[PDB]
């Protein structure tokens, strides 16, 4: 919960770049893959997001899978401050 804001911002940015965040169930872990933060910081943030809509979470084998809803996307837009016609994977990352 006691999260330095820069880290949070970074996490948000990462999410917007992707739309998907996969994180190990590892509190007491120094660094997360891709993001320059502790795993715990990520995981708790995602939990918080979930708790008021925003993010959908899945568990499978000690390894959290986080996806986003449209409300979540909106929230991200509001907070991170990205305009419109931008990345995610929710409204097509490209064409697959």
């Amino acid at each position: 919960m006691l999260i330095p804001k820069e880290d949070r911002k970074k996490i948000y940015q990462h999410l917007f770049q992707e739309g998907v965040l996969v994180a190990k169930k590892d509190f007491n872990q120094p660094k997360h893959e891709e993001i320059d933060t502790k795993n715990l910081f990520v995981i708790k943030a995602l939990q918080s997001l979930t708790s008021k809509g925003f993010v959908k979470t899945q568990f499978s084998w000690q390894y959290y899978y986080y996806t986003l809803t449209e409300e979540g996307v909106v929230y991200l837009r509001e907070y991170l401050n990205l305009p419109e016609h931008i990345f995610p994977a929710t409204y097509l990352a490209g064409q697959s």
């Binding site: 996969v22 929710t90 097509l92």
Partner: protein, 223 residues
């Protein structure tokens, strides 16, 4: 690169298992049935079989794309080395897993359990299976718990023809008083097999001889 061959194989299997688990977790509402993995040159091919294909697809690259991304994040592949393909589970009744899922859904909804079981059995029969066996274990009215058993048709139990023809499914259903367990068996028709043996090993059927009026004294056909 540079890992023992047996070990590599084991890891592959493990990965597959993990994937299956993930699919079970996620695509329950869509009615997930089976995964296929093809490690071809350049790209890994994940084929998904689910009851709701459209849902899986999403907004043509909304849900599937997300799934792909997740996979990439997990097993660490390049953005473009994983492809996903949703498919029709051909004959939903001949899939036990699907049936189990359906049953679970029904239970969740709040259907009469016995009735539901009967319906399932009927469906199975329609699908053209030799036999169905549905065991529903748990607390079905009153605290003292009992496994109810709803069956129809053939069924085998012992031998190697079990893993050949009998398809099994086990799903536990969560309710606010305790857990149910739904165990579904389907005996597939031996004649309608595609790949493998086309009958039960004990079944011996002989062909009929043809009619004879033979003697009538020598004679020769000449050219």
């Amino acid at each position: 690169a540079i890992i023992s061959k047996k070990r590599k194989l084991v890891a592959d299997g493990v990965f597959y298992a993990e994937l299956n688990e993930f699919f079970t977790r996620e695509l329950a509402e869509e009615g997930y049935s089976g995964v296929e993995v093809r490690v071809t040159p350049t790209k890994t091919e994940i084929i998904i079989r689910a009851t709701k294909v459209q849902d899986v697809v999403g907004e043509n690259g909304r849900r599937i794309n997300e799934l792909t991304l997740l996979i990439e994040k997990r097993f660490k592949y390049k953005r473009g080395t994983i492809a996903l393909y949703a498919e029709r589970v051909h004959d939903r009744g001949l899939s036990a897993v699907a049936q189990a899922e359906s049953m679970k859904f029904k239970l969740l909804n709040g259907l009469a359990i016995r009735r539901a079981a009967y319906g399932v059995v009927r469906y199975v029969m329609e699908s053209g299976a030799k036999g169905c066996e549905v065991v529903i274990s748990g607390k079905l009215r009153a605290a003292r718990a009992k496994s109810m058993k709803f069956a129809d048709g053939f069924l085998i139990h012992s031998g190697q023809p079990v893993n050949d023809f009998i398809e099994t499914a086990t799903r536990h259903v969560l309710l606010r008083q305790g857990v149910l367990g739904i165990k579904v068996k389907i005996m597939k028709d031996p004649s309608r097999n595609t790949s493998g043996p086309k009958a039960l090993p004990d079944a011996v059927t002989i062909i009929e001889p043809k009619e004879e009026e033979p003697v009538l004294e020598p004679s020769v056909k000449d050219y």
